[PDB]
């Protein structure tokens, strides 16, 4: 049985929630990841840093689908991220699909995750999550959104941002390249350029993981016969697809 029914994250004299700051520091040391919003789609991406040339990078997904039109990515402690995607995926059903018969909108799911992340601050016997997530998604009534979530459970919507290692440099880069007229193709291109400075090693479709929330892909639905279901808006790129845009770059 548990014994730590008390908060492990508490206010200090200065007003700091120590452990949250420390979790943020873990995210600083995380591999650079970022998101960019366009007029007709959102894109997220990160560097697949590998811990061994014998590991098969394909097996590990840093970019993951939460719902058919929402996708996530992170910087920080992977395992904490992994369990967050499992919990996030489920809540999207328990707290929404299973009662409104539709996926939740982007902002609401981000809330369900902030909610989880919040409770790890305040609750008995636990440390805060050691990750910052970027969530990209589209719903019918708000359009394409881009949200960030920190260990505190705070979330801010962005036009574009980057988190992790080279974050101040990248947001610097992004802050001068972005504008309200971007087309997905252009934002994909910028994301790849921002990520070039954040990588020392090889830079290609196998060392990069990049996904988008854009048009609906019937070729990805799995069935036909239902005219009101067009496929998911989440589409992950292949090594190939990336490299076509690297020659161009």
């Amino acid at each position: 049985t548990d014994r730590y029914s008390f908060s492990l994250t508490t206010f200090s004299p200065s007003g700091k929630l120590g452990q949250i700051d420390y979790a943020l520091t873990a995210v600083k040391q995380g591999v650079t990841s970022l998101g960019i919003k366009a007029t007709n789609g959102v894109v997220i991406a990160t560097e697949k840093k590998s811990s061994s040339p014998l590991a098969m990078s394909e097996t590990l997904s840093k970019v993951s689908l939460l719902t058919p039109d929402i996708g996530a990515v992170y910087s920080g402690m992977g395992p904490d991220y992994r369990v967050l995607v499992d919990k996030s995926r489920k809540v999207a059903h328990t707290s929404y699909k299973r009662i409104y018969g539709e996926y939740p909108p982007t902002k609401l799911l981000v809330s369900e995750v902030a909610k989880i992340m919040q409770e790890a601050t305040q609750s008995g016997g636990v440390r805060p999550f050691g990750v910052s997530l970027l969530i990209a998604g589209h719903d019918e009534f708000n359009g394409f959104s881009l949200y960030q979530v920190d260990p505190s459970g705070s979330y801010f919507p962005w036009k574009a941002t980057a988190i992790g290692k080279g974050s101040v440099a990248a947001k610097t880069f992004l802050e001068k390249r972005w504008n309200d007229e971007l087309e997905l193709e252009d934002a994909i291109h910028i994301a790849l350029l921002t990520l070039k400075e954040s990588v020392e090693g090889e830079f290609n479709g196998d060392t990069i993981e990049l996904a988008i929330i854009g048009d609906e892909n019937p070729d990805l639905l799995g069935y036909t016969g239902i005219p009101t279901d067009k496929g998911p808006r989440f589409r992950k790129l292949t090594s190939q697809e990336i490299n076509d845009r690297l020659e161009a770059l």
Binding site: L65, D86, R89, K90, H93, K97, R98, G101, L221, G222, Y223, T224, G225, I226
Partner: protein
């Protein structure tokens, strides 16, 4: 309800009528008894409608979540297993008799699931009020190794059998086809043999025919 499932050489097909009744009355002359569990695992239900839908959407919610966790496409046996274990726990109080079919990495499949928890396997199956009429046809025309088209005609004939002779079933034929290579093709109202003939006269009323005591605008704004 009249529902069936028929296995063909490279897959499986399921069919259903579209009459939904409350006692002798026809609540809906065209509802869909074909339910998606996962893109390539569809399910046809009979018995208590709310139960067949709720137990379908519920398993399909989990099956999704499972497929995501495991990173593998969902299998017909998973959907079968989760269904029966649920139904069983509820001792038949969930009125759901189903025919679960589909294709997955391990090949094509066809199963039956009764409200109490028992499941069966086979190449041709039927459940519902037409369960006997349809099965009369299936026993008459099913052969081993049949083309996709042979199978669709057969599954569609078995549901007509139901529609006509059985009063528990009527209206139209829905069909879902699951071929091992391809995407599942849900053909809603694949057959519409029962169209109401043009009425003998328009019943539209001369405006004002109805007495009105009082009028009001209604406010939706803020």
């Amino acid at each position: 309800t009249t529902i069936v499932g028929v296995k063909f050489n490279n897959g499986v097909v399921i069919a259903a009528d579209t009459r939904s009744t409350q006692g002798p009355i026809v609540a809906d002359k065209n509802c869909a008894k074909l339910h998606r569990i996962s893109p390539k695992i569809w399910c046809a239900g009979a018995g208590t409608a709310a139960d067949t839908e709720a137990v379908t959407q519920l398993i399909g919610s989990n099956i999704e979540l499972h497929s995501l966790y495991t990173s593998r496409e969902p299998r017909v046996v998973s959907a079968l297993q989760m269904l029966k274990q649920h139904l069983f726990k509820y001792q038949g109080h969930i009125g759901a008799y189903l025919i679960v079919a589909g294709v997955d990495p391990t090949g094509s499949h066809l199963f039956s699931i009764h409200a109490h928890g028992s499941t069966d396997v086979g190449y041709y199956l039927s459940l519902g009020s037409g369960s006997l009429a349809a099965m009369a046809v299936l026993e008459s025309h099913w052969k081993q190794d049949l083309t996709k088209e042979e199978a669709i005609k057969l599954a569609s004939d078995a549901i007509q059998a139901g529609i006509w002779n059985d009063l528990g079933s009527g209206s139209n034929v829905d069909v879902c086809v699951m071929e091992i290579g391809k995407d599942a093709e849900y053909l809603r109202n694949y057959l519409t043999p029962n169209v109401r003939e043009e009425k003998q006269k328009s019943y539209k009323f001369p405006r004002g025919t109805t007495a009105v005591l009082k009028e009001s605008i209604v406010n939706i704004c803020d």
